[PDB]
Ligand code: HEM
């Protein structure tokens with residue numbers, strides 16, 4: 175139930191241990207006034223310092239003037255911080271406003287079309303995002319609700335996604351979680367303790383060509399539907415061949431333990447792990463941080479199920495793009511469909527109590 | 537603790553301790569064959585015994601014949617029982633099948649239309665329900681996903697709702713939870729410790745008129761959306777006046793502590809507590825066991841959030857119906873809308889290892 179520090183060289187919510195719950199929101203900007211937008215970023219930063227420490231925003235949830243609406247909506251009263259992190263990102267579309275066109279980073283690349291894509295335009299894109307992660311869903315909803323309220327008249331919610339359980343790991347010392355296909359997901363990631371790998375593959379550097387982004391990262395979000403009727407009638411051998419790992423232990427084919435290193439040539443040529451591995455992609459490595467979702471039934475007698483896939487990287491052109499291109503022949507494609515997509519530049523950390531989200535850009 | 541016993545005179549998940557998470561599903565029946573349906577109830581009961589003890593269904597999630605589909609879909613491997621309870625109920629529409637029309641309980645009453653209802657037919661009704669409650673949401677979802685799979689060809693999923701209450705790892709057991717309006721919710725309820733009040737207000741008795749239902753109960757489910765952004769623009773005073781309790785402590789007006797008994801005359805005439813209180817309703821008293829929901833945002837950017845209201849009672853005609861009728865003028869109506877509804881008869885418990893869900897009805 176402890177707090178995660180809000181200040182640092184980088185934003186929290188990336189290398190941080192993965193929390194149980196997600197509430198992700200994408201917002202579009204409705205004001206043309208640069209000064210008013212800056213004022214919003216500062217007020218949001220102040221609220222975030224309170225929320226991540228388990229305190230109410232502004233003057234509190236009660237005990238003010240009877241005739242005024244309370245500053246905080248009150249539904250997190252008496253709850254612990256619950257490892258709340260709040261991570262902000264800026265979409266490519268933001269850079270068409272406030273005279274920012276020449277500051278759009280080259281590494282914030284638009285994604286190509288991929289075979290099999292069926293993207294819903296209303297649950298794609300966005301001028302900006304807030305990723306709220308916490309171990310308590312009520313704490314995460316409270317944060318998003320209060321930020322949206324503060325932003326009334328300057329930003330609107332475009333789309334949101336809740337994640338009921340994690341399907342990722344930045345802590346290899348702890349149990350790896352399972353996705354809704356029943357396999358462990360997160361074994362070969364980047365750990366929060368691997369400082370050299372984070373510097374090489376995740377954090378943007380000064381030399382990369384965009385000074386304001388130094389210490390930030392780039393985020394790809396993909397909403398992926400799972401064809402669970404089709405999957406659940408597949409044989410055990412079929413399921414294991416798709417991935418290249420066994421279902422029970424999650425060991426590479428032929429080996430005994432989860433964390434034994436894969437031997438790729440024993441896997442089928444279209445196995446997911448074989449196609450996604452760094453050695454198959456010229457060394458390209460990602461930090462995966464996604465969550466499972468279910469949004470009701472599909473209207474055809476079945477549960478809906480999916481995975482909200484989140485990846486962080488130093489450059490979209492050298493991280494997600496080459497790996498997803500290599501997945502064109504993946505055996506997994508028979509059982510999934512990408513139905514939503516967004517990219518964001520995630521700025522550097524808030525250094526201290528006088529700093530604010532986006533200060534290096536504005 | 538870690539597990540809740542499955543066997544009993546009553547089904548678990550009613551009077552047993554309230555768990556942190558819900559997955560509620562309504563099912564429609566696609567078979568006309570009574571024997572095939574009974575076979576399904578037996579298979580489902582066997583699966584439920586496994587699930588509630590933290591074991592995989594059938595022969596397991598791995599290690600069988602490579603060329604067969606696994607019996608269990610595998611996403612709960614490595615998790616704990618998590619206090620899972622599975623509670624089954626039968627809707628009025630089931631009793632038009634299998635020759636059961638003369639065994640529908642009179643206490644399983646159809647609800648009247650109430651003022652301001654805006655019910656979505658696709659998220660209403662259903663022949664059957666399973667209420668899955670657990671501390672870990674993946675344990676609850678895995679239960680529903682595997683029951684639906686076992687039943688494929690005889691039942692389909694009509695509608696499904698996820699919900700949340702407190703997170704017990706971080707929040708004391710004695711603290712009342714808050715709903716998404718920021719008010720404490722559950723102060724004056726029937727507790728699972730109150731054996732006599734359960735016998736009076738919750739469990740069906742033999743003399744009530746339907747022998748197969750003795751030790752069962754009746755469930756009303758209402759999906760209630762909150763107009764969150766309108767509520768959040770109301771003054772503190774307006775919010776407190778709507779309920780008749782203060783927001784910080786949750787005490788009745790003119791009192792000091794949450795658990796102080798209310799003085800109804802100090803509240804406004806259309807305050808929610810005043811209208812809902814048993815003394816306003818001829819002594820009618822309910823067991824509330826609902827969960828908050830947040831599904832996402834709608835097409836206008838508004839939060840799709842609310843309360844998935846669940847009430848158990850000895851008779852729908854003397855429990856939910858009188859109380860909800862008395863809320864016709866509730867000040868809360870400005871901020872909520874009922875958008876889904878269903879009613880179920882929840883049979884008695886599974887007595888021992890040879891018994892099965894629905895045995896008193898089917899024989
Ligand atoms: C519903 C979609 C997906 C499922 C169910 C899934 C499942 C898995 C599983 C079970 C593993 C093996 C355990 C592990 O090392 O984490 C894995 C590995 C991996 N996946 Fe996926 N995945 C999906 C989508 C994607 C996407 C879209 C990408 C990237 C474009 C991706 C990239 C990776 C990578 C890089 C690995 C690690 C390979 C290695 O270095 O050994 N996955 N995935």
Ligand code: HEM
Nearest residue numbers: 715719720721722723724760809812813814843859860872
């Ligand atoms: C979104 C919908 C609702 C909200 C936000 C809500 C909220 C509350 C709150 C804050 C209390 C006071 C604390 C407590 O004793 O639990 C309360 C009490 C109560 N509510 Fe509601 N409620 C809702 C809907 C309903 C409905 C549909 C019914 C019944 C048909 C109902 C019946 C009651 C009862 C019986 C009490 C206890 C009164 C007493 O004996 O003091 N509520 N509700």
